[PDB]
Amino acid sequence: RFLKVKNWETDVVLTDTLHLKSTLETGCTEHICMGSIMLPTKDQLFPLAKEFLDQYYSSIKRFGSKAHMDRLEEVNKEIESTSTYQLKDTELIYGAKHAWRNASRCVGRIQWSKLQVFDARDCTTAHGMFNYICNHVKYATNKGNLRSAITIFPQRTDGKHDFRVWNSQLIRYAGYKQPDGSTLGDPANVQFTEICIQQGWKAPRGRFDVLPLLLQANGNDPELFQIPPELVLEVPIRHPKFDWFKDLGLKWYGLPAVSNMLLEIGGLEFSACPFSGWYMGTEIGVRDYCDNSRYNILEEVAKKMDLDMRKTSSLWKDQALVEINIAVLYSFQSDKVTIVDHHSATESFIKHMENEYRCRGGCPADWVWIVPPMSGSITPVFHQEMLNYRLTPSFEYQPDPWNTHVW
Amino acid sequence: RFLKVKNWETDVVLTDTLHLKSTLETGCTEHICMGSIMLPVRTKDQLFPLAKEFLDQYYSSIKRFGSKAHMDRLEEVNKEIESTSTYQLKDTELIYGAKHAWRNASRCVGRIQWSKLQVFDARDCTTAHGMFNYICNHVKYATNKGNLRSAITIFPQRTDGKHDFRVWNSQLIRYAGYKQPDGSTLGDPANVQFTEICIQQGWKAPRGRFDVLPLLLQANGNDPELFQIPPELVLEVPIRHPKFDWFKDLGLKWYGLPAVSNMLLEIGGLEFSACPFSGWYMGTEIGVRDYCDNSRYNILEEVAKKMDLDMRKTSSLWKDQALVEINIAVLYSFQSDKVTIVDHHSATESFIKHMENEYRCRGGCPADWVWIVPPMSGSITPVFHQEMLNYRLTPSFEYQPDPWNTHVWKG
Numbered sequence A: 001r002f003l004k005v006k007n008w009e010t011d012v013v014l015t016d017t018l019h020l021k022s023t024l025e026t027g028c029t030e031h032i033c034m035g036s037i038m039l040p041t042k043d044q045l046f047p048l049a050k051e052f053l054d055q056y057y058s059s060i061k062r063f064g065s066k067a068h069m070d071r072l073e074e075v076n077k078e079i080e081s082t083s084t085y086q087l088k089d090t091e092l093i094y095g096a097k098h099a100w101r102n103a104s105r106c107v108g109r110i111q112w113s114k115l116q117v118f119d120a121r122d123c124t125t126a127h128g129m130f131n132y133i134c135n136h137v138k139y140a141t142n143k144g145n146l147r148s149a150i151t152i153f154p155q156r157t158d159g160k161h162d163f164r165v166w167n168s169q170l171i172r173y174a175g176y177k178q179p180d181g182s183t184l185g186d187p188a189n190v191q192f193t194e195i196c197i198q199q200g201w202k203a204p205r206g207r208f209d210v211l212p213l214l215l216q217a218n219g220n221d222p223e224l225f226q227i228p229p230e231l232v233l234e235v236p237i238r239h240p241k242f243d244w245f246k247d248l249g250l251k252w253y254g255l256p257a258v259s260n261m262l263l264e265i266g267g268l269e270f271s272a273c274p275f276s277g278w279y280m281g282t283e284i285g286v287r288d289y290c291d292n293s294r295y296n297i298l299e300e301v302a303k304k305m306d307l308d309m310r311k312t313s314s315l316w317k318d319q320a321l322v323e324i325n326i327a328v329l330y331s332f333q334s335d336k337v338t339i340v341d342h343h344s345a346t347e348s349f350i351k352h353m354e355n356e357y358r359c360r361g362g363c364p365a366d367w368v369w370i371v372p373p374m375s376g377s378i379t380p381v382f383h384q385e386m387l388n389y390r391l392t393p394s395f396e397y398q399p400d401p402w403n404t405h406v407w
Numbered sequence B: 001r002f003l004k005v006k007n008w009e010t011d012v013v014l015t016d017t018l019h020l021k022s023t024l025e026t027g028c029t030e031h032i033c034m035g036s037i038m039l040p041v042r043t044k045d046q047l048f049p050l051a052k053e054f055l056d057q058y059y060s061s062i063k064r065f066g067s068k069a070h071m072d073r074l075e076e077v078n079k080e081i082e083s084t085s086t087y088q089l090k091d092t093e094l095i096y097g098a099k100h101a102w103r104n105a106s107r108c109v110g111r112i113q114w115s116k117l118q119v120f121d122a123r124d125c126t127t128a129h130g131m132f133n134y135i136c137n138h139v140k141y142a143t144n145k146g147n148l149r150s151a152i153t154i155f156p157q158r159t160d161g162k163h164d165f166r167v168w169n170s171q172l173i174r175y176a177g178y179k180q181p182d183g184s185t186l187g188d189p190a191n192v193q194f195t196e197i198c199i200q201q202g203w204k205a206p207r208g209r210f211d212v213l214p215l216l217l218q219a220n221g222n223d224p225e226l227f228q229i230p231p232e233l234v235l236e237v238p239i240r241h242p243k244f245d246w247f248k249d250l251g252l253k254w255y256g257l258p259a260v261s262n263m264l265l266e267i268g269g270l271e272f273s274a275c276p277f278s279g280w281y282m283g284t285e286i287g288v289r290d291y292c293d294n295s296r297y298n299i300l301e302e303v304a305k306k307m308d309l310d311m312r313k314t315s316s317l318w319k320d321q322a323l324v325e326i327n328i329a330v331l332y333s334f335q336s337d338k339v340t341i342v343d344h345h346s347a348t349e350s351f352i353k354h355m356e357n358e359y360r361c362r363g364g365c366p367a368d369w370v371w372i373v374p375p376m377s378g379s380i381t382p383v384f385h386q387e388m389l390n391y392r393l394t395p396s397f398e399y400q401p402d403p404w405n406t407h408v409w410k411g
C-alpha cells in the first residue's frame, strides 16, 4: 500500500505514497491487466469540488484557514443554488497545471508548472472561439520559441450546450482517399477531412494541407475557419547528409496542439480546452512519418538510401527510421523551432519523476506511452518501473463530436 | 464476460474469453496498474484443487474429459495426495504441462513455437553430477550444431522446500563479470555477483571479457557443486559487421544458446524449481540489451567512436545509429555462421499471427505488452499497435528467489 518502484539501470528505488490519493479507475483488476489498452447530478458535484479545493488550499498552505472554509461554503452554496459552480481564476490555473501534472501518459511534464492558461470562459460563439484559438496559436508558437499554453472554453452545463473543437489537433494535415485506391496526405484525418468538405471546405487536395478549424460553441452546429497561414509555423524536412532528402517533399508543423480532450477540474467539465507544447522528435519522425497507417515513407526513404530491402534482417527499416528522425530534429533545430529528442525528453522525465517522488510522494506514469517508439531500451525510462493511476484534475478522452451532435 | 482487444494499425478486433480461466493475481487493482513492475512449502490443503484443474485441462485437450481414464486419474492423484502429501505427473502430463507453461508465458514473444518443445524428463536425477550430465545433453541437443531446437529439462519437483533442485546460474551459458578495484567491470556486469560466488566456490577464473561461467548445481537441497560445461558444447559466434571491417576488431562474440535456468515451472500445483529451458535468440536480446544497456557491455560509445558519429549532442541520434549497426552485426554474424536467430521484425510478425490464432482456437492469448514490444524500433513492429490483455494462466513459469539468498548451507 506504500509502493516501491525500481529503476533497473541504476538500482534507484522510489517509494510512492501519492497513489493512495487516486480516485478514478484504471481498467485493471487483480485478474487482468489492461495496461496496453488505448481507451479503457448535484450530489456527485460537491464531493468533487471539496476534494479539489482541499488540495488547492493545501498547495497555497492555507488548508483549514478561514479563507479555505469560506470558499468551501461559498461553493457549497453555489452548487445547492445553481447546480454548478465557477472556478476562481487562481483555481482554474492551478487545476489546468495539475491536470497536466497528472497526465500519466505525458513524458514532457517536467514543464508542468510553466503553463500559460488562457481563460476563455467568456466566449459565446465560434467566431469568438476562433479568435481565442488564433491568439493561442500565435502565443504558443512565439516565432518558433514555443511556449506551453492551454485555452479553456466555458464548462459543460446540461451537455446540450457543449463547446467543442472538432479537430483532434489545432493543426493537422488533410487526408483524401484517391480514386486510384491509395490515400493522399494524412490517412488518420480522412474522415475529418470529409466532414470538413461535407460541411463546406474547399480542399486543395494536396499532401500537406492544413485543415480548417471546425468550432462548436454552446452546442450549435460547428463552423469552418481557416487559421491564418502566417500563424501556422511549418518546417521543411531536410537531412544534414542526404541531399536527396529534401526532394521527398516532406514538411511538418511546429505546434503540437491537442484539442479534443476533456479537462476535469473539481468535478467541472471543460469539453473544449486545446493545449499545446512542443514536439518530441519521434512523434513526427517515427509515428507521423513511418507508421504504416500514416505517411508510411519508410520504403521510399530506404529506396533512396539503397538499402537491401529483400530481407527484414538487414534492418533497413531500422536504418531508414534513424535517418528520418535525424532529419526531423535537424530540420527543426535549423529553423530554430523548439523540439526535443527522445533522449533528452526521457532523461528530463526521470529527473521530473525523482522531483515528484521527493516533493509530492510519487508521479503517475504510463510506461506503455512514456517509452519512445524507437530505441526504447537506450532511453532511461525503459528501465524505470512506473505506477499508473488516475489523479484529478485530469485530461480525459471524450467521444468524437460528429457521433454525438444532435444536428 | 467477453473482452475486446484492438490492433490500432489494422483495426482488427479480437475477443478474449480465455481470461475467464485466469487464477493467479496480476499485481494490478482498479486503483493502480503495475503493468511495468518487473517482479510482481505448500500443503495438501490447496493441492488437490490445483491438481484437479490441471487434469481437467489435460484430459479436455486430449478429448477425454469425463472419461474413465480421467476419473481414474483424478482418483489416483487424490489418494496419492492424501497418502503421500504430493503426487507424480505421468510423462504425458509433464510434457503437456511444460508446453502449456510456455504457451501461457505472457512475456514471451516466441510462443508461436510452443507446441514444438523437446521435454527431457530428469525427474530420476539425484545428484549434482547427474544434473550436470542432463544439462550437457540438453545443451548438445538444443544447439544441434547451430540448428537450434527448443528444449526443457525438468528435474525433481519440490517436496518440503528443504530438498530443492536448483540451477544457481540464471542462464546455462553466460559470461563472467569481474568488478575491478578501479570500479570498472571486466566482462558482463550483470554476472558480477554470480561470478564472485563461483570464484568463492573454487572456480579458477580466466578473468577475460567472455569467460563462460561454470554451472553451479544444487541437487536435493545439498550444497551446490561447480561443473565446467565442455567448451566443445558451447557454441559461440564472433560478431562482425557486413560493411564495417573494424567491427570484428571490437573483439565481441556471443553464445548461440539462450537457456533460462532460474525459473520455476508450476504444473498442477507441483513446483519444479529446476527446469532449464532454451530456444533461440531474437537479435535484439544481444544487440540491444546485452551489448548496449548502460549496465551491460555498453559498447555504444566505442562503436559510435569508430563510426565517427557526431557524439557531442544526443540529438544527432548517434546512439540510435550505432544501435542499428550493432544489431545488423549480430544478425549478420549468426546467419553467416548458420546459427538460428530471428530478427525483431520477423519475431513480432509471427507473434501477431500466433496471437490471432490463439484468439480463434483458444479464446485468447495472454500477453505482456511491456515485454513483447522489442527494445528498439518499437512502433515499426506490429506488436506496438496491438492491444494486449495480461493475465496469468497455469501451467506457468514463475520467478523464484535467488538460491544463494535462501539456501541453508551444509558446509
Ligand code: HEM
Pocket (backbone or CB within 6 Å): A096, A100, A103, A105, A106, A107, A108, A109, A111, A115, A148, A149, A150, A275, A276, A277, A278, A279, A280, A283, A340, A345, A369, A395
Ligand atoms: C511542452 C512539451 C511537451 C512534450 C515534449 C510532450 C510530450 C508528449 C508525448 C510524446 C506524448 C505521447 C502522446 C502521443 O504519442 O501521441 C504526450 C502525451 C500527453 N501530453 Fe504531453 N507534451 C508536452 C506538453 C504537454 C502539455 C502542455 C499538456 C497539457 C497542458 C500535455 C498533456 C498531455 C496529455 C494529456 C497526454 C496524453 C493524452 C493521451 O492519452 O492521448 N502535454 N505528451
Ligand code: HEM
Pocket (backbone or CB within 6 Å): B098, B102, B105, B107, B108, B109, B110, B111, B113, B117, B150, B151, B152, B277, B278, B279, B280, B281, B282, B285, B342, B347, B371, B397
Ligand atoms: C524458441 C524461440 C524463442 C524466442 C525467439 C523467445 C523470445 C523471448 C524473448 C525476447 C523474451 C524476453 C526476454 C528478455 O528480454 O529477457 C522471452 C521471454 C520468455 N520466454 Fe521466450 N523465447 C523463445 C523460446 C522460449 C521457450 C522454449 C520457453 C520455455 C519453454 C520460453 C519461455 C519464456 C518465458 C517464461 C519468458 C518470460 C521471461 C521472464 O519473465 O523473465 N521462451 N522470450
Ligand SMILES: Cc1cc(N)nc(CCc2cc(CCCN(C)C)cc(F)c2F)c1
Pocket (backbone or CB within 6 Å): A108, A256, A257, A258, A261, A275, A276, A277, A278, A279, A280, A283
Ligand atoms: C501538447 C502536446 C505536446 C506534444 N509533444 N505532443 C502532443 C501530442 C500528444 C497527444 C496525442 C493525442 C492523440 C491520441 C490518439 N492517437 C494515439 C491516435 C492526444 C493527446 F491528448 C496528446 F497529448 C501534445
Ligand SMILES: Cc1cc(N)nc(CCc2cc(CCCN(C)C)cc(F)c2F)c1
Pocket (backbone or CB within 6 Å): B038, B110, B170, B258, B259, B260, B263, B277, B278, B279, B280, B281, B282, B285
Ligand atoms: C528460451 C529463451 C529464448 C530467448 N530468445 N531468450 C531467452 C532469455 C529470456 C529470459 C530472460 C530471463 C532473465 C530476465 C532478466 N530480467 C528479469 C532482468 C528470464 C526468462 F525466463 C527468460 F525467458 C530465453
Ligand SMILES: C[C@H](O)[C@H](O)[C@H]1CNc2nc(N)[nH]c(=O)c2N1
Pocket (backbone or CB within 6 Å): A008, A382, A383, A384, A385, A386, B035, B036, B037, B038, B370, B371, B372
Ligand atoms: C521497468 C521495465 O518493466 C523493465 O525495464 C522491463 C521493460 N520491458 C522489458 N522487455 C523485455 N523483453 N525484457 C526486459 O528485461 C524488459 N525490462
Ligand SMILES: C[C@H](O)[C@H](O)[C@H]1CNc2nc(N)[nH]c(=O)c2N1
Pocket (backbone or CB within 6 Å): A036, A037, A038, A368, A369, A370, B008, B384, B385, B386, B387, B388
Ligand atoms: C496498443 C498500444 O497501447 C498502442 O499502440 C499505444 C502504445 N504506446 C503508445 N505510446 C505513445 N506515446 N503514443 C501512442 O499512440 C501509443 N500507442
Ligand SMILES: [Zn+2]
Pocket (backbone or CB within 6 Å): A028, A029, A032, A033, A034, A035, B028, B032, B033, B034, B035
Ligand atoms: Zn495493469
